[PDB]
Design an enzyme around this catalytic site. Sequence first.
Site, mmCIF file in Angstrom:
data_model
loop_
_atom_site.group_PDB
_atom_site.id
_atom_site.type_symbol
_atom_site.label_atom_id
_atom_site.label_comp_id
_atom_site.label_asym_id
_atom_site.label_seq_id
_atom_site.Cartn_x
_atom_site.Cartn_y
_atom_site.Cartn_z
ATOM 1 N N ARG A 35 0.808 -1.222 0.000
ATOM 2 C CA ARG A 35 0.000 0.000 0.000
ATOM 3 C C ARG A 35 0.843 1.274 0.000
ATOM 4 O O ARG A 35 0.456 2.272 -0.590
ATOM 5 C CB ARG A 35 -0.915 0.034 1.214
ATOM 6 C CG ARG A 35 -2.092 -0.849 1.035
ATOM 7 C CD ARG A 35 -3.093 -0.785 2.154
ATOM 8 N NE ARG A 35 -4.256 -1.558 1.717
ATOM 9 C CZ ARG A 35 -5.448 -1.565 2.299
ATOM 10 N NH1 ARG A 35 -5.663 -0.843 3.380
ATOM 11 N NH2 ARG A 35 -6.444 -2.255 1.755
ATOM 12 N N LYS A 196 -12.734 -11.993 6.691
ATOM 13 C CA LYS A 196 -13.540 -10.793 6.909
ATOM 14 C C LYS A 196 -14.940 -11.026 6.287
ATOM 15 O O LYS A 196 -15.304 -10.459 5.260
ATOM 16 C CB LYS A 196 -12.820 -9.604 6.261
ATOM 17 C CG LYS A 196 -13.139 -8.213 6.790
ATOM 18 C CD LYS A 196 -12.263 -7.195 6.036
ATOM 19 C CE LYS A 196 -12.587 -5.747 6.373
ATOM 20 N NZ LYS A 196 -11.783 -4.820 5.529
ATOM 21 N N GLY A 353 -6.211 -7.093 0.534
ATOM 22 C CA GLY A 353 -4.893 -7.096 1.141
ATOM 23 C C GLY A 353 -4.129 -8.417 1.087
ATOM 24 O O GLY A 353 -3.053 -8.483 0.489
ATOM 25 N N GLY A 376 -12.281 -4.138 -0.111
ATOM 26 C CA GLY A 376 -13.675 -3.749 0.069
ATOM 27 C C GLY A 376 -14.142 -2.663 -0.909
ATOM 28 O O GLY A 376 -15.269 -2.716 -1.435
#
Length: 398
Positions: A35, A196, A353, A376
């Site tokens: 990132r 998640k 990720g 997301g």
Amino acid sequence: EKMTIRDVDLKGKRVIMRVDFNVPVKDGVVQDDTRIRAALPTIKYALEQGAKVILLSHLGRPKGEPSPEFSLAPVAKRLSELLGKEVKFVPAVVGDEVKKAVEELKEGEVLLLENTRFHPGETKNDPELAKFWASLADIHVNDAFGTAHRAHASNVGIAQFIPSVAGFLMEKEIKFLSKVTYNPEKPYVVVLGGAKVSDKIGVITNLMEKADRILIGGAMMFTFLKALGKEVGSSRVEEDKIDLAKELVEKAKEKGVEIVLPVDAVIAQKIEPGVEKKVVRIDDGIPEGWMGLDIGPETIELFKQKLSDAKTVVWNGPMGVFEIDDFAEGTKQVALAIAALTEKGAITVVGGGDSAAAVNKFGLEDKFSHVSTGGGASLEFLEGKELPGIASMRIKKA
Ligand SMILES: Nc1ncnc2c1ncn2[C@@H]1O[C@H](COP(=O)(O)OP(=O)(O)NP(=O)(O)O)[C@@H](O)[C@H]1O
Ligand SMILES: [Mg+2]
């Protein structure tokens, strides 16, 4: 087309830039800098144009109060290493300390503020927080694609006070995903996995509108599997979402959308390397004691079959706990099956990720059409509506 950092004069200006530096940190060291590296182009460009740069970002989800473990201090050190230039870090979000630092900022210097979420106003899109931040600069650059689905003070709030333009990452992400968002060649298959659960299950109802098949793996398979009766055993299930899962499997049928669930699982009593694993079938049940930790050999073959003819594949979520080689086969083989389609002409997108980390781990990074960590944000983008953090940016005119 949104205005970009290229369409503004930066010379001598104070530019407040929102980046997504929400990276994994362990013992004060960034474990995955993907990132940060993705944001570098934008940062380097502003510095060369002689701008004074202030960076804003969140890290995790603090209660809304400070916590050493959620500090951006480790990230500033890493950014300095990656940039090859000193980065000044101010362990404050608001205040005199922040005003003073921005004040003493020279052309071509970078300042990183503390975690935006240490302030309660950030996630509430508090107009007073946004106003303070806007007061420190002339232009706002939104390069935080991973947070584009969040309407927060730092990415949406500030834009209502000063001009907000896109950075290079934000640009690249939109450019790519737009192809897939509006004109996806069919069959369009979505592959969901990961842990998640509570965050991803909701996109299914919308994804169901444009996708042909939906393969579910990772820990997510168990909330769906349990919803169908099955003995999940010790496996991770998201209790509060079982009822929704039940409605989704039902609705998929009525809508002619195929949701492919696993048939077998690699289970193990412990989640550590080298231990004894036994491939069991779900119909046979996972005995309370053994946890499903990777899709089994049968599912790998099924998923491969169901993927073989896809023209568009969107993948988010590891099939199993790929971190431990013992439970990484599902992930590797699926990744390999998807990378193969790319060569055959399919548009393949990896978002998330750990999914990005997974493809990196296997040396497959250049084998997909597009790779993103904005997991997301990208799933939501595919739904078609304009994301709040994208809507907040200035349209390009003349
Ligand atoms: N069966 C499983 N049981 C438990 N954890 C699993 C299992 N399979 C995958 N996971 C874990 O879930 C993690 C991946 O989670 P997730 O954060 O949901 O994916 P991601 O690719 O980062 N996507 P996003 O959060 O959308 O960017 C890894 O730590 C995996 O080991
Ligand atoms: Mg993740």
